[PDB]
Amino acid sequence: GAAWGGSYVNDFIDRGRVKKVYVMSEAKYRMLPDDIGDWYVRAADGQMVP
Amino acid sequence: GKSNVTEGALVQNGQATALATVQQLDPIYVDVTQSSNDMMRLKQELANGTLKQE
Numbered sequence A: 001g002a003a004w005g006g007s008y009v010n011d012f013i014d015r016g017r018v019k020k021v022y023v024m025s026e027a028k029y030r031m032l033p034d035d036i037g038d039w040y041v042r043a044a045d046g047q048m049v050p
Numbered sequence B: 001g002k003s004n005v006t007e008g009a010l011v012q013n014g015q016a017t018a019l020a021t022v023q024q025l026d027p028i029y030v031d032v033t034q035s036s037n038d039m040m041r042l043k044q045e046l047a048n049g050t051l052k053q054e
Helices: B035-050
Strands: A009-014 A018-024
Touching: none
Parallel strands: none
Antiparallel strands: A009 A018
């Protein structure tokens, strides 16, 4: 929900104005059903899982 | 690379930690982590098939 979605995180301060911070996947990595498998999620021990 | 032991630390008969990691680089393995059902589904398409090899 924060790769494929784009999650608001908090705000930052640009030029003395309060502006949002969105984590999101890059374009070329959320653009196909094939790019499901490129997302790696951390197990109990810290070995990555596609 | 390093010297994980230094010039005087007592080492034992086949201890746990290495003294120094030698390392050979002129060929190099790349351990490539295919997902489980994808290596499954490629052998599946080598029997559908065709798929091919090279």
